[PDB]
Amino acid sequence: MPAYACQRPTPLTHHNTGLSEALEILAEAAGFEGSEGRLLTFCRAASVLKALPSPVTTLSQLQGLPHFGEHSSRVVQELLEHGVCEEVERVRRSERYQTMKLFTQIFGVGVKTADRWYREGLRTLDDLREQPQKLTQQQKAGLQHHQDLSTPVLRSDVDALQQVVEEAVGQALPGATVTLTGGFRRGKLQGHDVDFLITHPKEGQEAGLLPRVMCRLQDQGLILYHQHQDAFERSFCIFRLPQPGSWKAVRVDLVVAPVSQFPFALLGWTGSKLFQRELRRFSRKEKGLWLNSHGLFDPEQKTFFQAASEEDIFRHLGLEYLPPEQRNA
DNA sequence: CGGCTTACG
DNA sequence: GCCG
DNA sequence: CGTA
Ligand SMILES: Nc1nc2c(ncn2[C@H]2C[C@H](O)[C@@H](COP(=O)(O)NP(=O)(O)OP(=O)(O)O)O2)c(=O)[nH]1
Numbered sequence A: 001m002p003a004y005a006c007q008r009p010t011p012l013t014h015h016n017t018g019l020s021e022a023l024e025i026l027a028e029a030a031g032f033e034g035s036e037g038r039l040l041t042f043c044r045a046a047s048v049l050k051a052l053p054s055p056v057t058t059l060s061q062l063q064g065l066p067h068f069g070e071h072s073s074r075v076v077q078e079l080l081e082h083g084v085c086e087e088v089e090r091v092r093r094s095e096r097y098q099t100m101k102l103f104t105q106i107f108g109v110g111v112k113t114a115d116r117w118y119r120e121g122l123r124t125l126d127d128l129r130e131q132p133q134k135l136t137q138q139q140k141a142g143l144q145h146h147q148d149l150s151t152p153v154l155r156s157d158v159d160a161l162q163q164v165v166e167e168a169v170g171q172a173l174p175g176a177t178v179t180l181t182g183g184f185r186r187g188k189l190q191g192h193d194v195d196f197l198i199t200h201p202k203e204g205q206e207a208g209l210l211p212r213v214m215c216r217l218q219d220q221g222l223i224l225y226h227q228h229q230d231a232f233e234r235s236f237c238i239f240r241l242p243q244p245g246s247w248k249a250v251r252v253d254l255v256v257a258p259v260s261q262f263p264f265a266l267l268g269w270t271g272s273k274l275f276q277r278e279l280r281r282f283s284r285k286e287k288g289l290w291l292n293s294h295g296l297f298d299p300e301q302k303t304f305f306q307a308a309s310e311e312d313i314f315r316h317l318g319l320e321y322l323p324p325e326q327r328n329a
Numbered sequence B: 001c002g003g004c005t006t007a008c009g
Numbered sequence C: 001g002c003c004g
Numbered sequence D: 001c002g003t004a
């Protein structure tokens, strides 16, 4: 079992679901407390279990697995022996965890904002609604749409959304394309949002595209919130999606890249978040190359790698290719 | 011990 | 919290 | 700060 998540396939569904869930509770709780190193280790240990070919049934099967030391092994041991881990259950029922989870779910609220509200004594969404002076416009939109945004987006919703985005994109710039990215490209059947990557085959034609796309969608009445409702290339918006006899709010992320950068942008925005962190760490620490969603930089030659495909990028990094479905770290 | 992904809005 |  |  390799030490980096980008060195092994990780399928969406696997054989250690309960164990990985518990470790991810501890990871999440570590993040709420600002302990990013502990979050990383608990996330990595959970991901190792996702990559295993069969269920862990005995403690001895953790021998030699990377990212399993005293703490993560004790969590697994307790789950194997009793079906529950006391530390995990204490986190689950704690007021701090439940409130930080609730608050950071709000679009526009991160750990730092949630933690400040917690320290001020706020605990519920209605507590926030009674203090609208504390809220940015983004947070007001996240708070008002929170119920809809807590409802999973279905794969059957995604096709309808892509067609409406493609219509606006085609008027904004004929020839521009829309590619589904994020969790749905990795094979997920539901999601917290829908992620799209937009480009044009002629380099440079994509300059200035996203404002034109957003104004066309807003004219169609489809945009419940976006940050520009001057030049921008990413938009994190709330969209109006049809439902039977009604509509529901859905989060949609739109990103524009030049076609020269499209393989890097596709790789970055396809995720998973941990897969990409691991891939970028691998690139820098093991290969001495700097990876981001725009390119891959050799800091000694001071040169950028040209890539025509995701396959190119894996080859550059000396990694076996993983299709999106196996990037579910 | 230092390190822990890396951008744009 | 774990790795190198 | 937020988003990814
Ligand atoms: N490098 C990097 N990439 C990131 C980061 N955050 C997001 N991405 C990339 C990788 C992510 O795949 C992509 C957008 O994915 P999401 O919509 O944030 N989540 P997903 O679609 O997996 O699941 P669901 O939506 O159902 O919760 O942006 C980050 O901090 N760093």
Ligand SMILES: [K+]
Residues within 6 Å of the ligand: A103, A104, A105, A106, A107, A108, A109, A110
């Ligand atoms: K949030």
Ligand SMILES: [Mg+2]
Residues within 6 Å of the ligand: A182, A183, A184, A191, A192, A193, A194, A195
């Ligand atoms: Mg997504």
Ligand SMILES: [Mg+2]
Residues within 6 Å of the ligand: A182, A193, A194, A195, A253
């Ligand atoms: Mg997204």
